[PDB]
Ligand binder design. Structure first.
Ligand SMILES: Nc1nc2c(ncn2[C@@H]2O[C@H](COP(=O)(O)OP(=O)(O)OP(=O)(O)O)[C@@H](O)[C@H]2O)c(=O)[nH]1
Ligand SMILES: Nc1nc2c(ncn2[C@@H]2O[C@H](COP(=O)(O)OP(=O)(O)OP(=O)(O)O)[C@@H](O)[C@H]2O)c(=O)[nH]1
Ligand SMILES: Nc1nc2c(ncn2[C@@H]2O[C@H](COP(=O)(O)OP(=O)(O)O)[C@@H](O)[C@H]2O)c(=O)[nH]1
Ligand SMILES: Nc1nc2c(ncn2[C@@H]2O[C@H](COP(=O)(O)OP(=O)(O)O)[C@@H](O)[C@H]2O)c(=O)[nH]1
Ligand SMILES: [Mg+2]
Ligand SMILES: [Mg+2]
Ligand SMILES: [Zn+2]
Lengths: 442, 173, 430, 430, 442
């Protein structure tokens, strides 16, 4: 029943703003924290409970924390439209940023703020009766997202136990870039995140910009569009807990079906009916068409091509007016294709889910209104190319000690670079060996 | 209650037990790593290993602003069904009996390839080798696999399209 | 002669809701529990599935078990949900995760004592107890683990009754779960030792029933669960109404199982027909028999033409002569003689019951014991061997605590079962 | 004594629609399927071609097969199309391509199992089964390939029944298809081994009947298919109505076939005459006999004067004296004695049935076994040799997979059939 | 049942405008695809399905793609009258043309644009259930039509396999000419088309100009008249799939009946009642008259005289009020003629088709209204004369390497000219050998 959302840093807080806007409009909680006038104790109305808790006066408040080291974005939330929705204690802000240094966030600044975060999460977890996981939003490219996200996941992993941790992560784009030190922060973040996360979903802004240019008709997209797409995907994955359906899927089922070996937990995500209102009137949107859509790499929110690898498992979530025979026919048609390949040790490659609630439409949005949608998260060996491309840039920079004095000055041993680089080399070797056919292995 | 039952079904049980149990032995470490014996001849992400029986992708900048992505194809697979399963259709499916490749019996009923345009869509240069889609596993008139091969321990072996190795060199005086 | 039902997991609870709707309709019980039937013949055997409550109410002899209450909350909120006794819902606080070891060892042992307490309270209340009936899926987590745990405990506690199971098994074409081979193999290993008779259903076969026979444009799980509820309520119909040739679950078991391991059967139900076709064919015993043996009407992927029938049973509902039933069963045995095991002189048992289900002039349910079921087990064992050689997803099961020897024993026992079926298929008198 | 009909391909489905209209009219069946006849004589043999639906309705025992549903969609939209059982329509998703090898080997093996399942379901329901009846063209693709494939399978499964075919064959003057010689030769090779009796019709003969004999101003394919349906329904008339001298399909075969390979026959129907000329001449047994032997009323281009009759059969419908029939058959045999084979003392069998077709006082259908059919086979063998020596279109058939040895075997078998007919034509006692 | 149309370049798009105008007016779909505000379905029957698909709301959209490298013609389609009929993704346009270079279309630019075209065609083929062929319209005289048409047919032949591909091709007229480099492009096109096409129908503008001057009364014809005649021919050949008739003909039957050897797949086309309104009321138009008309060279749409060769196969399609007995009598009379000769190895030279739907009348059209028409496609050795003249012009220019540096600059080896020239020489020898009498060779 309950799930707690943790939002970290700039991308994570802005995506949180889009997500809670969506969850409010889908359940019907007004921006001032009030159920509409037509809802009473006359009928059973509890679906919000997965994301909201009600006070004794009947106000709703959401099960989320927003974490930042700079005040500006949380002060924008405090001064924005949803001022009365959030409890003021939930919006925690420090004085100064981690300045793109993972070392500054982890060692110098996040250690001061971390105890307040664990106390707030504990205060939320005490007001629950069926918590079944944490959802985490952060970027690994920036200093506070990497450092405080790693430190907080480590502390949560020590305090709590046998609880799932699912991450939605914005990785550094392969040629679009925002900072020079992106490789160092991404390597050290992935090194800490490898041991303490059950499934990690990867997003790339360059891919979602391509998707908003290609599918929608937006010439000059901005982060609010990207954040609305991310909000739709998270709403689709968590819809299985909140509404009636033929085949529900608990968050623990994702880790069981998608992860074959404990280190192999990085998955691709895609969403099918990304379409504009003018295109929506030229096309029917049947189950088989959107099922065919989720497998094209042009539909993915991470810049990787799955044709350079092999799939090990796929999880397909259908929501809306769908009938099981059409889901079975669609999955059977995909399996026939020769350019889609699965490793020979994974014969039963699919997990299915079917939910009746269609996706909600947001007043200023750019997506059309549709009766059905499908969302996919999948595990594939193609991910080794993303790490290989980050590692080449790391090797280029570390060969000349390009920026190390900053990291050593803020408190970190230089040895940590070599340890993380060796762990990523071993992860590359795991992805090389796992893709080897069994017939050649004898 | 199981005396005569086990006595009468003895020899077949021992035969199947002697066959299956060697296969159940683990060949991979608990970390997902191969044992010291029977190493693979080549690494997995090599061009000829990854695309042994599948065309490699083609990338182009058309339609994209940033790093391009490939596209799916409609190439179907062989019309093979599990042994002893009813002809199941949940709805109208696209059977693979049709879309039979045009390389079937090409060298017998026709004159074979008579132009270099086969390199545009049928012959690929994958890494240090050559892939040809017309020289794979043999199929019958109804797009069904003819031959099935097994290792010493009894694992099905997939087909290969790799025909030859190209000795590439840079030029000099 | 009353049966106690157990519904476990999502599939079991959903099929159970439709079963109790069909049974409540046939005996005229309002969803409030009040009798509103229209013949005394309905009341005189109501005890078989219902227990009697004091005022104007009836309560159903069923135990509901699940590890997360989501499904139970959906069925309790349903239109017939009120009939169920509140104390009969047993639930934990975290899901099985579709993992057999978690469902069998950690939360299973935590809840099993409370489930056994409810089952004993219900059993010791009966004046004479007939067998238990259990519905669950084999591919899931709480269904497989807690169902087989409870089956083992009830076989220790009630070894003289009958144990009957209805089970959902993985389709040969598309998987609904990635780890189905492990859960299926361990569950079949537990069932072949513990069960007396087990029926297996493929969702793919029900999809083919819906598309080819009923031509439904937009079927829903309510239709599949209605077909299953129809056959399950049909096998027991002769237990609870008068007839010219009575039959019973124990008598069916005695006639169907030649040897104790050969207890896996196929099922079918005959008067299925599309809304357009009914004007073209009147009901008659030859038409029912022809649909009864058509593989299109069989709820498993294996086809009879690759195996042989050791035994079969047909239960007829309706007003009919015994001569046409006997001669139809003789004609089908004589015309298809190569598909019947020759060292048994007559493979089909017939039974006739006077009262058909409402709205049908006649109906028959078919149960079949055919050696072609060995190919399904062979396919599951092959996929298990493919996954185990590479230790596929094994760390979840090993992390809960299971010894790998359990996996090798279950695989070896199932492989011996396929070999045993193959030997009796090709046996000869000599 | 029940007949099962099979309709294959475009020609077969189109002729079948008109045949079932004629049969439904003769037995007074409404296009809704309700019996509305006016004499018990119509009802007492309805079982021969119809199956019984419950209240008033009757359903026709026919299987329709085609690779693209276009023709079936045309017949289902027709005025009597609704009577056909929906489950009896079998179709694929791609055409025969007018190619025999595709129809026999690639799409044939894909669909044949569903056709055999329907044919077995229809055959095993009869209390006593008479022969099968098949309509198809030999020049086409799915008609030739799947018709001969199905005939071979039914001859393996039902070797003790009768196998009857009505077949359309290429005209000597204009082709409707370029690859006709290959399809015709392979089909005749299959038929001469498998078939018991085969009737052949030329479309050119139906065009000449309509334009010259009936003087129709604007004939349509409905008229040609009506002439074929009239003779087809006439051959079976003695099976389903009373008469002074009953006859049967097996009795026709026993009197017509001297040796098992000589089973190809010519057909004719006698009372064809224009509505303007009917007033000048009345109906009588001499008039029917004169029209019956007139080559104008024969449905093939070959003329009897170039061959000799081994045997012939005449089936008369109507109330008439046996004296006139006997004396007419004796007078025709004595006056034209050179055209009758001398080592058989009487070549004509007669049969008399009381009930004529509505609106005619009397009618006769004529079946003739004449050696002039050798000219057709010789012409087809010549055209086959012309195409095969030059590999004219052979790559299509060889690309599907056929061995050229099949072509040489079929040519050799047809050449031996032509030689055998020529030797028996010129045989003598010595 | 369904067929997909691919339009390439300028001639193919302009002929497509006339084709879709005719198919809309014949089925009854409005030019914008909508329906009156009170109806629930725009038309009572599904017959449109061969060429159009309807959405669940009942809008119609057509099964076609338009491919061009210059934007102008596709932009004219986007701004014209049928703007709402087509889905905007189907209208694909590049930035710059192939500049009359086969090498530029095939190697440099079409290689970049081809993957978008294949993705659109795949999206159409996924929304089908009984596809039975591709129809292609292009001219081989221009650069993008030749180069991208060949490259796309090669890729289609690998991906779809056995499915039939029927081409309508505009070849360079024997004395009317538009560009200097036409022979090189036509030779290289014919070289690619030999291996990768099942039947190719050839058209020449000089023949349609002659037909419009003699039969129609047009003093100043333009491409719209020729394109309307081509659309009528395509409608006649595809009518057998869409309306009731006595003898239907599926698209797979053409390849089986017309092609004796795998290289001999080039056919001549003619249409009988091409007549003006003033002549139509002075003459009766019986079956035998139009059957006699189709064999006269004044009726042909390709500039070749069939009296200088031998027929191998003829396919005659009759549509309208015709009776089979008259078709049989007419064909026997044609067979009697002495200037019509068949090779002695082809005794059964004819295939017939008979359809009941008479030809449609278009509001701005120039054809009269007639109750019946017949269309013929036939294979004849006379076609060898067209190739001999193209090959002689190629030899004249190639003796001095007159323009080869453009082709070599755009990516092609000089060897490809010589290879194509020997393949066309071998095709000429094939047409000499196939025409040799069997009685002469003993
Ligand atoms: N999709 C998306 N990406 C964002 C958003 N905001 C920032 N990013 C991306 O994330 C990276 C920057 O990370 P930040 O979140 O700004 O880093 P930080 O967490 O603020 O760390 P500090 O700078 O030390 O405070 C760049 O790649 C940005 O493109 C957002 O709102 N949406
Ligand atoms: N019948 C007919 N012929 C046309 C039409 N348009 C162009 N042609 C002819 O086709 C040839 C020119 O080919 P184009 O289509 O212009 O070449 P393209 O496809 O545009 O190739 P690029 O010039 O490289 O862009 C000439 O012989 C023209 O006479 C048309 O609409 N109808
Ligand atoms: N026929 C049928 N199958 C079902 C139903 N619900 C789930 N299943 C199937 O059962 C399997 C999932 O097992 P599940 O019941 O979720 O296992 P659990 O998690 O242990 O309860 C899949 O194959 C589903 O397709 C249902 O109502 N009817
Ligand atoms: N008498 C008659 N002949 C037909 C009819 N339809 C087609 N034919 C002939 O049968 C031959 C064509 O065979 P067809 O039925 O098309 O073969 P298919 O393509 O396998 O169905 C030609 O000689 C046609 O003239 C029909 O309705 N009546
Ligand atoms: Mg920041
Ligand atoms: Mg141009
Ligand atoms: Zn090429």
């Amino acid at each position: 029943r309950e799930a707690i959302c943790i939002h970290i840093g700039q991308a994570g807080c802005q995506v949180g703003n889009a997500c809670w806007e969506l969850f409010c409009l889908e359940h019907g909680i007004q921006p001032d924290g009030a159920m509409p006038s037509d809802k009473t104790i006359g009928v059973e109305d509890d679906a919000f409970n997965t994301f909201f808790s009600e006070t004794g006066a009947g106000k709703h408040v959401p099960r989320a924390v927003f974490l930042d080291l700079e005040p500006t974005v949380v002060d924008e939330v405090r001064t924005g439209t949803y001022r009365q929705l959030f409890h003021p204690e939930q919006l925690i802000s420090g004085k100064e940023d981690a300045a793109n240094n993972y070392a500054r966030g982890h060692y110098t600044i996040g250690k001061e703020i971390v105890d307040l975060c664990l106390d707030r999460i504990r205060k939320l977890a005490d007001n629950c009766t069926g918590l079944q996981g944490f959802l985490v939003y952060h970027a690994v490219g920036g200093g506070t997202g990497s450092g405080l996200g790693a430190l907080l996941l480590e502390r949560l992993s020590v305090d709590y136990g046998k609880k799932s941790k699912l991450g939605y992560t914005v990785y550094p784009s392969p040629q679009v870039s925002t900072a020079v030190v992106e490789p160092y922060n991404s390597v050290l973040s992935t090194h800490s995140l490898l041991e303490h996360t059950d499934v990690a979903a990867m997003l790339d802004n360059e891919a979602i910009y391509d998707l908003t240019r290609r599918n929608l008709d937006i010439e000059r997209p901005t982060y609010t569009n990207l954040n609305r797409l991310i909000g739709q995907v998270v709403s689709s994955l968590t819809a299985s807990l909140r509404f009636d359906g033929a085949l529900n899927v608990d968050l623990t089922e994702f880790q069981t079906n998608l992860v074959p070996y404990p280190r192999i937990h990085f998955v691709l995500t895609s969403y099918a009916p990304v379409i504009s209102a003018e295109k929506a009137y030229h096309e029917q949107l049947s189950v088989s068409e959107i099922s065919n859509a989720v497998f094209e790499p042009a539909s993915m929110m991470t810049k990787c091509d799955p044709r350079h690898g092999k799939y090990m498992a796929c999880c397909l979530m259908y929501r809306g007016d769908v009938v099981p025979k059409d889901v079975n026919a669609a999955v059977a048609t995909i399996k026939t294709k020769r350019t889609i390949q699965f490793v020979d040790w994974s014969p039963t490659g699919f997990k299915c889910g079917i939910n009746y609630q269609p996706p909600t439409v947001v007043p200023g949005g750019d997506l059309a209104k549709v009766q059905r949608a499908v969302c996919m998260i999948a595990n594939s060996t193609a991910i080794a190319e993303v790490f290989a491309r980050i590692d080449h840039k790391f090797d280029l920079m570390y060969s000349k000690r390009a920026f190390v004095h900053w990291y050593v000055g803020e408190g970190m041993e230089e040895g940590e670079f070599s340890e993380a680089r060796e762990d990523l080399a071993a992860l590359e070797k795991d992805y090389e060996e796992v893709g080897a056919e069994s017939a050649d292995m004898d | 209650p199981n005396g005569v039952f086990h006595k009468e079904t003895l020899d077949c049980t021992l035969k199947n037990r002697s066959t299956l149990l060697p296969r159940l032995r683990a060949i991979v470490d608990g970390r997902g790593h191969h044992l010291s014996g029977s190493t693979p001849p080549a690494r997995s992400f090599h061009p000829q290993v990854l695309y042994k029986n599948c065309p490699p992708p083609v990338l182009s900048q058309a339609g994209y602003d940033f790093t391009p992505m490939s596209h799916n194809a409609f190439l179907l697979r062989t019309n093979d069904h599990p042994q002893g399963v009813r002809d199941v259709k949940s709805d109208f499916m696209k059977g693979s009996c049709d879309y039979r490749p045009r390389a079937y019996l090409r060298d017998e009923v026709s004159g074979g390839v008579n132009s270099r345009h086969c390199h545009c869509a049928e012959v690929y240069q994958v890494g240090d080798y050559t892939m040809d889609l017309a020289r794979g596993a043999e199929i019958d008139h109804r797009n069904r696999t003819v031959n099935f091969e097994y290792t010493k321990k009894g694992t099905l072996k997939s087909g290969s399209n790799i025909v030859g190795k190209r000795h590439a060199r840079v030029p000099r005086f | 002669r009353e049966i106690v039902c157990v519904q476990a997991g999502q599939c079991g609870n959903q099929i159970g809701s439709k079963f109790w709707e069909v049974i409540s309709d046939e005996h005229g019980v309002d969803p409030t529990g009040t009798y509103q039937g229209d013949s005394d013949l309905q009341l005189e055997r109501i005890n078989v599935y219902f227990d009697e409550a004091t005022g104007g109410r009836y309560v159903p002899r069923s135990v509901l078990i699940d590890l997360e209450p989501g499904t139970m909350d959906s069925v309790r909120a349903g239109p017939y949900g009120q009939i169920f006794r509140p104390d009969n819902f047993i639930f934990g606080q975290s899901g099985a995760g579709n993992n057999w070891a978690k469902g069998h060892y950690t939360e299973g042992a935590e809840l099993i004592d409370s489930v056994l307490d409810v089952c004993c309270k219900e059993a010791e209340s009966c004046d004479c107890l007939q067998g238990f009936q259990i519905c669950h899926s084999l591919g899931g987590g709480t269904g497989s683990g807690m169902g087989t745990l409870l089956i083992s405990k009830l076989r220790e506690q009630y070894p003289d009754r009958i144990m009957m199971t209805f089970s959902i098994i993985p389709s040969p074409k598309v998987s609904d779960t990635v780890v189905e081979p492990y859960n299926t193999t361990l569950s079949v290993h537990q069932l072949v030792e513990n069960s007396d008779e087990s029926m297996c259903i493929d969702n793919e076969a029900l999809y083919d029933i819906c598309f080819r026979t009923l031509k439904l444009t937009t079927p829903t799980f309510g239709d599949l669960n209605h077909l299953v509820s129809a056959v399950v309520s049909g096998v027991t119909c002769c237990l609870r109404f008068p007839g010219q040739l009575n039959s019973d679950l124990r008598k069916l078991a005695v006639n169907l199982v030649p040897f104790p391991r050969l207890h896996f059967f196929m099922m079918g139900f005959a008067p299925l027909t599309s809304r357009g076709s009914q004007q073209y064919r009147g009901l008659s015993v030859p038409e029912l028999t022809q649909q009864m043996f058509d593989a299109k009407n069989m709820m498993q992927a294996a086809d009879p033409r690759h195996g042989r029938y050791l035994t079969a049973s047909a239960l007829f509902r309706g007003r009919m002569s015994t001569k046409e039933v006997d001669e139809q069963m003789l004609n089908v045995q004589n015309k298809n003689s190569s598909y019947f095991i020759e060292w048994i002189p007559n493979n089909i048992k017939s039974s006739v019951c006077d009262i058909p289900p409402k709205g049908l002039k006649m109906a028959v349910t078919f149960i079949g014991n055919n050696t072609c079921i060995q190919e399904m087990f062979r396919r599951v064992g092959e996929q298990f061997t493919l996954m185990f050689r590479r230790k596929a997803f094994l760390h979840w099961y090993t992390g809960e605590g299971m010894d790998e020897m359990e996996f090798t024993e279950a695989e070896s026992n199932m492989n011996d079962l396929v070999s045993e079926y193959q030997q009796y298929q090709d046996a000869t008198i000599e």
